[PDB]
């Protein structure tokens with residue numbers, strides 16, 4: 001197609017929970033709150049937000065923790081955009097129960113437009129996607145929800161791509177699909193119109209200038225019902241990175257189940273499981289898996305992880321290591337619900353970078369909405385090296401433990417560890 | 420199609436090595452030597468044998484063990500059929516090296532016809548199939564080679580189906596394929612003629628009278644190049660039994676590798692591996708795997724077995740147990756090469772019976788020749804119950820050990836056990 005001449009600059013943003021300290025103070029990345037506040041300050045034309053839920057203040061959480069100031073500050077700034085003329089459009093998954101939306105109603109009276117999307121009817125899933133589009137020039141893609149706990153209590157990772165007009169405009173078309181479906185009584189068309197179609201797929205990714213160095217990038221979405229003809233499915237993009245890896249594969253995802261969860265009877269789903277086994281056996285690829293464990297983790301997830309870590313010995317010449325990332329929690333942090341977990345969902349190889357917003361279960365690629373960014377770059381350094389250094393910081397950390405560790409040793413209440 | 424009115428009677432024959440004693444003397448099945456000698460005594464019209472190799476006497480083994488008398492007796496009887504007018508046709512895989520054939524030349528001068536089939540060129544494999552066809556009325560299908568060690572030193576299992584003219588004639592067409600390929604300069608046709616075509620596939624198995632009770636049976640062969648249009652591939656038949664099981668799956672096979680062995684680079688082959696994982700997860704099927712370990716077992720096979728036995732806990736509600744069958748060997752038995760192993764290759768479910776002649780690796784269904792018999796029967800009892808009782812005798816035996824057993828404990832030299 002046509003190349004993008006915009007001076008695209010990519011910044012890796014992550015939120016470090018209070019109490020998590022890394023002695024190797026060498027990465028130094030901006031926090032999600034700092035990036036969000038900077039994005040809101042420079043917004044003057046439009047702002048498109050796709051979110052799972054809105055719990056940006058202490059009222060919805062029904063708590064009195066003083067760590068919600070950063071979350072409240074974002075909400076305070078969001079209420080000032082509409083008066084200045086910024087077209088704020090928010091797509092939020094419709095809650096299952098009758099939960100009041102104090103934050104969304106606050107923005108509704110300010111002048112924003114909020115639309116609830118019934119994923120449970122259209123695709124029998126939810127809207128797990130999380131991204132921003134500011135002025136169609138800068139976009140944020142990551143795992144951070146609209147929580148005050150997502151900025152100070154949980155550990156996350158996202159990417160803010162500045163001054164990339166061509167790439168942000170591609171993300172808008174994904175948001176246009178949710179905006180169209182948010183309309184009451186609107187069903188999924190058999191074929192999407194050209195408006196939502198894209199020409200930058202896996203086969204022909206777009207060419208950008210990431211910090212000067214040329215690179216190839218393309219966006220992959222889910223579920224298929226919503227993907228137009230030119231959009232690469234998220235599972236296909238995920239498997240392509242695993243198939244093309246030749247040296248190593250680094251995966252840090254909160255949950256990994258090779259099963260269609262919720263759907264009963266238990267459906268087996270060996271899509272990503274087979275890709276990892278092929279990589280380590282057929283090729284000399286070393287695979288490192290970093291999974292997050294907390295009180296609400298599925299206990300069935302351990303059996304499928306022990307079945308994967310078993311394939312590592314001299315005879316088979318395979319190398320799979322599985323480690324659990326447990327965020328320590330004291331009594332004060334334990335009182336906050338859904339507050340101490342590692343939320344990062346991304347994959348790093350020796351040649352490609354994958355950053356997604358959906359877990360690695362079966363429903364997140366067939367029923368649940370989601371979006372992932374795939375950037376490849378020639379030569380050493382760049383975004384891939386920065387992301388690789390983050391993974392190694394987590395891997396060689398006191399908060400990452402093996403699968404045979406006693407559950408008392410870790411700071412939190414891990415359900416995947418025996419005794 | 421048309422049903423078979425022949426009074427088909429099926430007998431399970433197995434060879435028990437010297438020194439192997441089962442206190443539960445309740446099965447009582449005839450030995451392979453007894454069945455073979457009875458088959459040869461009643462042969463008057465024809466005899467078709469498909470074999471891997473011929474080592475029926477002490478000369479080829481270059482040993483002086485007195486346990487080869489049974490093997491020599493079979494060879495002595497085989498030399499008398501041709502004088503009586505029996506048309507003896509033998510298909511034997513061509514040896515890789517220049518190994519002399521003392522047994523085959525002995526039969527050649529008697530009047531038999533011996534043809535060597537170059538599987539290493541036609542399908543880049545070997546002729547691992549093992550079956551007999553006596554007078555086109557009685558056929559033996561099993562794992563027993565033409566060894567004197569296959570009758571007294573190794574443990575095997577086969578089925579002799581008496582008075583089944585319709586079923587034996589179906590097995591002849593498989594032998595006709597090897598006979599056609601045994602001709603020098605004969606290549607695999609693109610489409611087999613009608614002569615080798617069959618009408619009793621998995622979709623429409625033939626109806627027989629197994630000991631009076633009606634039953635459905637069909638033969639499955641390999642590799643596909645040799646399977647005509649109407650012949651069910653062996654892998655498809657094997658996977659159908661696993662897919663249709665609802666209560667339990669009992670598997671006793673010498674080697675189980677989800678990889679295309681020999682073929683390099685290491686090719687992954689999760690065909691049967693995925694079927695077993697689906698059965699235990701999606702359904703409440705209990706899977707029991709009995710693998711044979713000896714000095715020549717592939718050490719890489721342990722990692723793929725530990726990766727399968729890991730999927731068994733309350734949370735996942737799965738039940739996979741893997742055990743190793745080790746035939747004890749003293750100093751005298753150790754001196755005999757390739758002499759102390761469990762050679763049985765069969766699968767038992769709650770509704771179907773599978774008896775095959777090929778291991779469960781990747782090459783035995785794509786390159787290597789092989790044949791399997793699939794018999795299903797309504798109601799309790801019959802062949803399936805007899806085969807199930809054999810498996811439980813092996814499972815609850817002192818010669819079957821778990822994967823964590825020390826390698827010194829077992830009587831033989833097992834390469835799959837640590838320390």
Ligand SMILES: *[C@@H]1O[C@H](CO)[C@@H](O[C@@H]2O[C@H](CO)[C@@H](O[C@@H]3O[C@H](CO[C@H]4O[C@H](CO)[C@@H](O)[C@H](O)[C@@H]4O)[C@@H](O)[C@H](O[C@H]4O[C@H](CO)[C@@H](O)[C@H](O)[C@@H]4O)[C@@H]3O)[C@H](O)[C@H]2NC(C)=O)[C@H](O)[C@H]1NC(C)=O
Pocket residue numbers: 009010011012025026027028029030031034211381382383386
């Ligand atoms: C492509 O181009 C983009 C745009 O320039 C680059 O993005 C920059 O990345 C660098 C490095 O990650 C960023 O610099 C770092 O910022 C961190 C966070 O900034 C805040 O830090 C404190 C936190 O309280 C605030 O007080 C402060 O005002 C900032 O708002 C800093 O913490 C980092 O400093 C720490 O780490 C370094 C080592 O990394 C130590 O040497 C320091 O002493 C200190 O401990 C650091 O300054 C920069 O902010 C990003 N730019 C933007 C606009 O966000 C991409 O990195 C680039 N791509 C590549 C591959 O180079």
Ligand SMILES: *[C@@H]1O[C@H](CO)[C@@H](O[C@@H]2O[C@H](CO)[C@@H](O[C@@H]3O[C@H](CO[C@H]4O[C@H](CO)[C@@H](O)[C@H](O)[C@@H]4O)[C@@H](O)[C@H](O[C@H]4O[C@H](CO)[C@@H](O)[C@H](O)[C@@H]4O)[C@@H]3O)[C@H](O)[C@H]2NC(C)=O)[C@H](O)[C@H]1NC(C)=O
Pocket residue numbers: 428429430431444445446447448449450453630800801802805
């Ligand atoms: C469908 O129809 C066929 C045809 O009849 C049946 O096949 C018969 O199966 C039975 C049971 O397996 C066979 O009977 C058994 O034979 C064993 C081996 O026979 C030899 O045994 C000794 C070994 O040295 C020789 O001396 C002897 O002369 C035989 O040549 C015996 O060992 C068995 O006896 C032992 O076990 C039983 C318990 O099983 C004990 O009670 C005994 O005391 C003893 O310990 C037994 O006699 C029979 O031979 C088979 N027939 C043929 C023609 O081979 C199928 O079983 C049938 N299908 C079903 C489902 O019933």
Ligand SMILES: *[C@@H]1O[C@H](CO)[C@@H](O[C@@H]2O[C@H](CO)[C@@H](O[C@@H]3O[C@H](CO)[C@@H](O)[C@H](O)[C@@H]3O)[C@H](O)[C@H]2NC(C)=O)[C@H](O)[C@H]1NC(C)=O
Pocket residue numbers: 009162163
């Ligand atoms: C995305 O593109 C915009 C547009 O170029 C970038 O903004 C520009 O950033 C530079 C760097 O700070 C600014 O230069 C500075 O100007 C001040 C005077 O205002 C001067 O004192 C400094 O020494 C420096 O030269 C530039 O003014 C600014 N332009 C605009 C219109 O804001 C922006 O930085 C880019 N995004 C990222 C993440 O870099």
Ligand SMILES: *[C@@H]1O[C@H](CO)[C@@H](O[C@@H]2O[C@H](CO)[C@@H](O[C@@H]3O[C@H](CO)[C@@H](O)[C@H](O)[C@@H]3O)[C@H](O)[C@H]2NC(C)=O)[C@H](O)[C@H]1NC(C)=O
Pocket residue numbers: 428581582
């Ligand atoms: C396969 O079919 C043949 C043909 O029927 C079976 O052979 C028959 O077996 C019966 C049972 O032993 C024989 O009956 C016996 O006859 C003798 C006299 O010879 C008698 O003294 C016995 O009391 C008994 O009645 C029958 O003669 C025999 N027929 C032939 C032609 O051999 C054979 O048994 C069947 N196969 C199997 C495994 O059963």
Ligand SMILES: *[C@@H]1O[C@H](CO)[C@@H](O[C@@H]2O[C@H](CO)[C@@H](O)[C@H](O)[C@H]2NC(C)=O)[C@H](O)[C@H]1NC(C)=O
Pocket residue numbers: 312313314
């Ligand atoms: C694969 O082989 C390597 C090299 O032998 C093993 O690495 C060392 O092995 C020796 C003995 O085999 C141990 O004493 C060392 O502790 C091992 N070092 C490390 C860093 O592991 C390795 O253990 C073997 N197995 C695997 C799964 O790599």
Ligand SMILES: *[C@@H]1O[C@H](CO)[C@@H](O[C@@H]2O[C@H](CO)[C@@H](O)[C@H](O)[C@H]2NC(C)=O)[C@H](O)[C@H]1NC(C)=O
Pocket residue numbers: 731732733
């Ligand atoms: C699955 O649950 C069953 C029932 O609780 C377990 O069976 C017994 O479990 C208790 C405690 O959980 C043990 O003390 C017994 O020794 C178990 N009996 C047997 C025969 O195992 C069973 O262990 C659990 N796990 C699996 C894989 O079945």
Ligand SMILES: *[C@@H]1O[C@H](CO)[C@@H](O)[C@H](O)[C@H]1NC(C)=O
Pocket residue numbers: 058059
């Ligand atoms: C809820 O919001 C109100 C006003 O926005 C304020 O009182 C406070 O921030 C929250 N808590 C309570 C108890 O009202």
Ligand SMILES: *[C@@H]1O[C@H](CO)[C@@H](O)[C@H](O)[C@H]1NC(C)=O
Pocket residue numbers: 477478
């Ligand atoms: C080989 O066969 C011959 C004759 O068949 C006989 O001597 C014996 O059975 C075997 N062994 C030796 C040493 O010849």
